[PDB]
Amino acid sequence: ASQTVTIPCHHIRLGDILILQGRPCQVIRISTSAATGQHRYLGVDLFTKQLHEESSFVSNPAPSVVVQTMLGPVFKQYRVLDMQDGSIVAMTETGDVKQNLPVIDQSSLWNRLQKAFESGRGSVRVLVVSDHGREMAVDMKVV
């Protein structure tokens, strides 16, 4: 399962990727539980596209400190060596080659990647989520 970071709930917005029920999910709705007052997150699984919901974790790490948090995935950043048929050849920081790295069909990433890739390949990075063995490019950056 994906490595994670803890995100304060005040810093979570629609479109952020959270772990919901153990699954990396794009947040599509943020609401407050009437029963508990806590934030509830409705999200779309990046891989399966199924809906998942999870409420915030309330913790009390110190006197008068009440924290509502969620987990987000730790993104990896890969270089793009080539693009072929909806997948890319990516390279990790240590030179490990991923031949068939899926690109998520989300927010026109493939077209944005293609565009950025045609006008300087070396500066194109993909942000990659790695869940339960599976990896996928879910965003891109230019260095």
Author numbering: 31 to 173
Give verbatim excerpts from the published study on this entry.
Here, we present InCellCryst, an advanced pipeline for producing homogeneous microcrystals directly within living insect cells. We have demonstrated the pipeline on five different proteins (IMPDH, HEX-1, Cathepsin B, Luciferase and EGFP-µNS), representing a selection of soluble proteins of different source organisms that crystallize in insect cells in their native compartment or, in case of peroxisomes, readily in the cytoplasm or nucleus of the cells. Importantly, as shown for IMPDH and HEX-1, InCellCryst can produce crystals from native protein sequences, without purification tags or even remnants of proteolytically removed tags, within a quasi-native cellular environment. The rich source of biomolecules in the cellular environment allows the identification of native ligands by co-crystallization at quasi physiological conditions, representing a unique feature of InCellCryst.
